[PDB]
Design a protein around this ligand. Structure first.
Ligand SMILES: [Zn+2]
Ligand SMILES: [Zn+2]
Ligand SMILES: [Zn+2]
Lengths: 350, 136, 82
């Protein structure tokens, strides 16, 4: 299923070769029928989440083809997961309409700090995947004030929610040095350069002291800003080495080199992707098995789900999805093989 | 006529040098400015407080110096302490995130002084206004 | 003339309800109560659904005894997140 999701993402990413919708829809029909003979769509859709997380970047898709394939999938799949993918699409659309509304508001009531372009793309928490609690990297003054005015606007209109700005994902550009070259940075690099600006001769510990830079994912970015840069060579460090522990002093240099005015460091995205639950899962499996054999209480279709979670003392341990999958796979032979048309007799209390 | 502290602060905020010892220098200023006089002491303290609030000043140095300034606040008389508390709170409310570590302690001390003077309504509204759960 | 000027920023937010839940709408008591029936006679937990509708376990159980829909949204109720 990971391979099928990879193939689907690869085909939909580049629609130039075979822009006709007929060949694409026949490929999708083949994929759908192949998935039909298979089961366990949970890993399939979490892989969808992984590929669409790393949609968050530039679209580079066809959109309407995704809508058609998700509609044809929902026709034969049902709800919940199909509804949350519909939530993905609805969230993206409502985000772009809210962005249009905010732009209209800025045009109507002029704000000087709105001169910088804002492309807020707020998401939802109940449907989108979660990565972690995210760090608290410092924001430069002007972007901080722009996000503050956006927060003030969003707290108006419809209330009852807040915005916890993240820093893992994001795309930004910066004008640098001499002809003015436009560089592409992704959040953390922007703050690093902003700190570099106000004073030269900045060392790594000084940067780490007041930027709240991450620890584990810092490794990918640290070895991406140097140690294998392309011919653009925007920035280099004087302690040229494969590893830089604590006191590698960084220096700002012109390094005009390439004449291109849209030098981008997006290539780091092409290389950063590379590279005890035992007791908990044993306890969960044992609890589910003892619940499924022991209960045997009078149920029709749902009160068994109530009593099984009643028996446990602590919650989030039941996880009704496991009960659902257990009772679904429990129909293989006589026990719990009752008639779907009338789900009345369920061995009653035996 | 108490322009000595004012000129010292002015010389410090125009200091181009950002060496590590500067913070220590500021501490020296504190140990020469905690004790002085009456109303002009309040003037020096308010000039000090509005000196840290500038975004040009280093955030970590300003924050640590703000904690050092705050530790001596309870010894001040009630009225001056309340004035400085409200001044700090109104200076912090634009940039809440930059000083969202000691605002809780300042509000706690303010609420303690209110509850020790029977004025519970102001402490109640202050502790309503603190963004504890909403903060990341 | 600042050394670097920000021109674009694609921020990513994550909206969540300011109040997750404060009341079980079968007994008018908050979710950490005993659902009145357990308060009088003394275990008691909360239950959730796909619509993210927190209720007392006993309240939703006695509702499901004779009914099959969520009390608030009046659609098919099924258990999720215990
Ligand atoms: Zn209840
Ligand atoms: Zn109860
Ligand atoms: Zn409901």
């Amino acid at each position: 299923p990971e391979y099928l999701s990879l193939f689907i993402d690869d085909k939909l990413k580049k629609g130039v070769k075979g822009l006709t919708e007929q060949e694409v829809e026949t490929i999708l029909d083949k994929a759908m029928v192949l998935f039909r003979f298979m089961q366990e769509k949970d890993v399939f859709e979490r892989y969808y989440k992984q590929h669409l997380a790393r949609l968050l970047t530039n679209k580079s898709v066809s959109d309407d083809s995704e809508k058609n394939m998700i509609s044809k999938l929902k026709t034969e799949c049902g709800c919940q997961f199909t509804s949350k993918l519909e939530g993905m699409f609805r969230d993206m659309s409502i985000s772009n309409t809210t962005m249009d509304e905010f732009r209209q508001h800025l045009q109507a009531t002029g704000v000087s700090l709105g001169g910088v372009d804002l492309t807020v793309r707020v998401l939802t928490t109940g449907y989108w995947p979660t990565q972690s609690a995210t760090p608290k990297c410092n924001i430069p003054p002007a972007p901080r004030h722009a996000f503050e005015i956006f927060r003030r606007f969003y707290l108006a209109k419809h209330s009852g929610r807040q915005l916890t700005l993240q820093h893992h994902m994001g795309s930004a550009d910066l004008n640098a040095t001499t002809r003015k070259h436009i560089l592409q940075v992704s959040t953390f690099q922007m703050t690093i350069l902003m700190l570099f600006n106000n004073r030269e001769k900045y060392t790594f510990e000084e940067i780490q002291q007041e930027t709240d830079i991450p620890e584990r994912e810092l490794v990918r970015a640290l070895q991406s800003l140097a140690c294998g840069k392309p011919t653009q060579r925007v920035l280099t460090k004087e302690p040229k080495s494969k590893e830089i522990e604590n006191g590698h002093i960084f220096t700002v240099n012109d390094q005009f080199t390439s004449k291109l005015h849209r030098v981008k460091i997006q290539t780091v995205a092409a290389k950063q992707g590379e590279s005890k639950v035992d007791d908990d899962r044993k306890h969960e499996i044992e609890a589910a098995i003892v619940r499924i054999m022991k209960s045997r209480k009078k149920m029709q279709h749902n009160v068994l789900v109530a009593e099984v979670t009643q028996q446990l003392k602590a919650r989030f341990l039941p996880s009704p999805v496991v009960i659902k999958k257990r009772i679904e796979g429990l129909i293989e032979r006589e026990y719990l093989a009752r008639t779907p048309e009338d789900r009345k007799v369920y061995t009653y209390v035996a | 006529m108490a322009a000595a502290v004012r000129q010292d602060l002015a010389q410090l905020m125009n200091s181009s040098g950002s060496h590590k010892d500067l913070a220590g220098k500021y501490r020296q200023i504190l140990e020469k400015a905690i004790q002085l006089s009456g109303a002009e002491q309040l003037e020096a303290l308010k000039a000090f407080v509005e000196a840290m609030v500038n975004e040009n000043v280093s955030l970590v140095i300003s924050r640590q110096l703000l904690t050092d300034f705050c530790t001596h606040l309870p010894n001040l008389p009630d009225s001056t302490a309340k004035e400085i508390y409200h001044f700090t709170l109104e200076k912090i409310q634009p940039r809440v995130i930059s000083f969202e570590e000691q605002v809780a302690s300042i509000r706690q001390h303010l609420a303690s002084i209110y509850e020790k003077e029977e004025d519970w309504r102001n402490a109640a509204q202050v502790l309503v206004g603190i963004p504890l759960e909403t903060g990341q | 003339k600042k050394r670097f000027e920000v021109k674009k920023w694609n921020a990513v937010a994550l909206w969540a309800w300011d109040i997750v839940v404060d009341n079980c709408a079968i007994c008018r008591n908050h979710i950490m109560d005993l659902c009145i029936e357990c308060q009088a006679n003394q275990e008691c937990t909360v239950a959730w659904g796909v619509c993210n509708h927190a209720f007392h376990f006993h309240c939703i159980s006695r509702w499901l005894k004779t009914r099959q829909v969520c009390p608030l949204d009046n659609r098919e109720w099924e258990f999720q997140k215990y």
